[PDB]
């Protein structure tokens, strides 16, 4: 009776059987529907497509994400996503496979309720739990005192944990990360005259971001370097074989994690948000938090990000205090890996919510650990 573990990312859906070392489904969180007119009656085969098929089709299709900033805004497409996840990807009959699901913290409670209602009523799943991605990131990182920095496609959030106790007031969240960085990269590349407009071109700019971008250690020095020399410039080849060339823009994009002023946001960067979250923690906790600063993947894949963060935190925090940043190469999967661990734990299983309990406690039991 292998449990299922499904992580519904703002940009990637990750679903895997508990105790496996990696997710099996990693397909994009995407549904597409043709903007163009169909004429070959044998070929307009589907009115809608799921993210892997939808990506190849995207040249005709309009693409929409069903999740925005860890919030689900198109439940019909989200049901499509889960239906394809269970039947097409995992080839699994959910009648037998109790399920773990993930959410960002400080999400609307309605989102968790509606997701649970769909899971039981539509899919007839027999047991469910919802788990908080920072806790999974700590299980993936093998430790029970940590501060977690997360940045998926949508939310960025900071959660401190100490001896397995969570500090709900110390949580801090930014709706930023991948999507806003991609849009800003579209605007900056527009500064050079590469007009990208379509959602397909948005996906192309996402791939450009994921390959080319690197994080500056000294943003002003890098700007002076790119002004004085071409050595930072890179070329990339678009799907039609056109060549695009990019310079300072590369580091200028991820730098807008640290300086959201470039988006026009006033909220302080991920470094200052981490430091302030540490300051929210009680004084003794802070020393162990500086020793255990864990990165939850997604955008934190960038080159240089950990070194820049260490430089910033060491500048912000008092001297004579070890500041250490933990970011394994699995950091992107690490949320799912944490879920895969947690669902396996013999101690955990009584945390399950059973369809009986959902038929008796109403929804509200899903709130028990809403955090």
């Amino acid at each position: 009776t292998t449990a299922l573990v499904c992580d519904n990312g703002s940009g990637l859906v990750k679903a895997g059987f508990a105790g496996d070392d990696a997710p099996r489904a990693v397909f994009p969180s995407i549904v597409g529907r043709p903007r163009h007119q169909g004429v070959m009656v044998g070929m307009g085969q589907k009115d809608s497509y799921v993210g892997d098929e939808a990506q190849s089709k995207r040249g005709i299709l309009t693409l929409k994400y069903p999740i925005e900033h860890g919030i689900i805004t198109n439940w019909d497409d989200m049901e499509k996503i889960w239906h394809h996840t269970f039947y097409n990807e995992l080839r699994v009959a959910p009648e037998e496979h109790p399920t773990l699901l993930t959410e960002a913290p400080l999400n609307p409670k309605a989102n968790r309720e509606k997701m649970t209602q769909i899971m039981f009523e539509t899919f007839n799943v027999p047991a469910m739990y919802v788990a908080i991605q920072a806790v999974l990131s700590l299980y993936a990182s093998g430790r029970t005192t940590g501060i977690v920095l997360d940045s998926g496609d949508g939310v960025t959030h900071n959660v401190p944990i100490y001896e397995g106790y969570a500090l709900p007031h110390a949580i801090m969240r930014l709706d930023l990360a991948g999507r806003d960085l991609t849009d800003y990269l579209m605007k900056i590349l527009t500064e050079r005259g590469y007009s990208f407009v379509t959602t397909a071109e948005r996906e192309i700019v996402r791939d450009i971001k994921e390959k080319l971008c690197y994080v500056a250690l000294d943003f002003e020095n890098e700007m002076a370097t790119a002004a004085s020399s071409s050595s930072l410039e890179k070329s990339y080849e678009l799907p039609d074989g056109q060549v695009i060339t990019i310079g300072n823009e590369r580091f200028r994009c991820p730098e807008t994690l640290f300086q959201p002023s470039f988006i026009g946001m006033e909220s302080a960067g991920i470094h200052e948000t981490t430091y302030n979250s540490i300051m929210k923690c009680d004084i003794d906790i802070r020393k162990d938090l500086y020793a255990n600063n864990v990165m939850s993947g997604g955008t934190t894949m960038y080159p240089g990000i950990a070194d820049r963060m260490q430089k910033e935190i060491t500048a912000l925090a008092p001297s004579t205090m070890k500041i250490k940043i933990i970011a394994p190469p699995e950091r992107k999967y690490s949320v799912w890996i944490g879920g895969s661990i947690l669902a396996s734990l013999s101690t955990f299983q009584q945390m399950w919510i059973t369809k009986q309990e959902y038929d008796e406690a109403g929804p509200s039991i899903v709130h028990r650990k809403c955090f």
Binding site: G19, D20, D21, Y139, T144, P328, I337, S340, I341, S344
Partner: peptide, 13 residues
């Protein structure tokens, strides 16, 4: 680092 090892670690804890 493997998932089984982490499971055994937390189940031991």
């Amino acid at each position: 680092m493997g998932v089984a090892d982490l499971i055994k670690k937390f189940e031991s804890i």
